[PDB]
Structures are given as C-alpha cells and as structure tokens.
Design a protein around this ligand. Structure first.
Ligand code: HEC
Length: 108
C-alpha cells in the first residue's frame, strides 16, 4: 500500500500540460514522440507494436501498475537509464496521484 487516489479532472489537465506533447491516451489514438498508452496497465514496457522504443525500456520489462508508474514518473531516466523519454519528472506525490488516477481511468 503506497499509492492513493487523486483527482481525475486534476489528472486530466496535468496530462494535457505535461504528457500530451508526446502521447495520446485514447483507444486507437496514434503513436507520436511517445507511444499511445491506451491499455498500459497490466502491460509490460516496450510492447506496443509499431513503435520504436530504446533497448533500455524493453530490457527493463516493467509490469505497468500504479505503483511502478509512480516511481517511473518521479524520474524516468533514473528508473530506466537509457530511456529516450525526455521528461524531468513529477516529484510531487500529490500530482503523481492525480495523474495516475487519470491514466488508470482513460487508458482503460
Ligand atoms: C516527450 C518529450 C515525452 C513526455 C513529455 C512524456 N513522455 Fe512518456 N515517453 C516518451 C518516449 C519517447 C517514450 C519511449 C521510451 C523509450 O525509452 O523508448 C516514453 C515512454 C513512456 C511510458 C512507458 C511505456 C511503454 O510502452 O512501456 C510511459 C508509461 C509514459 N511514457 C508515460 C508518460 C506520462 C504519463 C507522461 C506525462 C507526465 C510522459 N510519459 C511524458 C515521451 C514523452
């Protein structure tokens, strides 16, 4: 027990200003700089087809759940050195919570 639920509305706007530049979240949403993340929970890293991911991400083979997604979110290059994900992070657990509450919801 280490992840508690945030606000999806607050999650959704965090997403629009911090992740939209690179990702789509809708079913059948296209890949961009970053891959489409629909269905990410339960899935492992580097398995969306039609996307060229770094060695590092495939290699890490992380099961995508809220718990994991939080630490990746804090510092991705940290969590997975070699990732091409150019994002500093979300150091605030509160923001992280909203946002994950949002992804838990839309990538559904
Ligand atoms: C572009 C400047 C990005 C921003 C901003 C965010 N992400 Fe991203 N993401 C990007 C890339 C290029 C990649 C590929 C990684 C590689 O090393 O090949 C990723 C990857 C992810 C993943 C992992 C998914 C998988 O298929 O295993 C996740 C869960 C992810 N990105 C989520 C995410 C969120 C929620 C963001 C906003 C806070 C975000 N990323 C920022 C590109 C970019």
């Amino acid at each position: 027990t280490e992840f508690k639920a945030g606000s999806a509305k607050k999650g959704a706007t965090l997403f629009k200003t911090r992740c939209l530049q690179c990702h789509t979240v809708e079913k059948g949403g296209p890949h961009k700089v970053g891959p489409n993340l629909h269905g990410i929970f339960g899935r492992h890293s580097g398995q969306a087809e039609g996307y060229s991911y770094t060695d590092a991400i495939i290699k890490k083979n992380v099961l995508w759940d809220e718990n994991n997604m939080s630490e990746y979110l804090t510092n991705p290059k940290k969590y997975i050195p070699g990732t091409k994900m150019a994002f500093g992070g979300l150091k605030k657990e509160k923001d992280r919570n909203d946002l994950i509450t949002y992804l838990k919801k839309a990538c559904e």
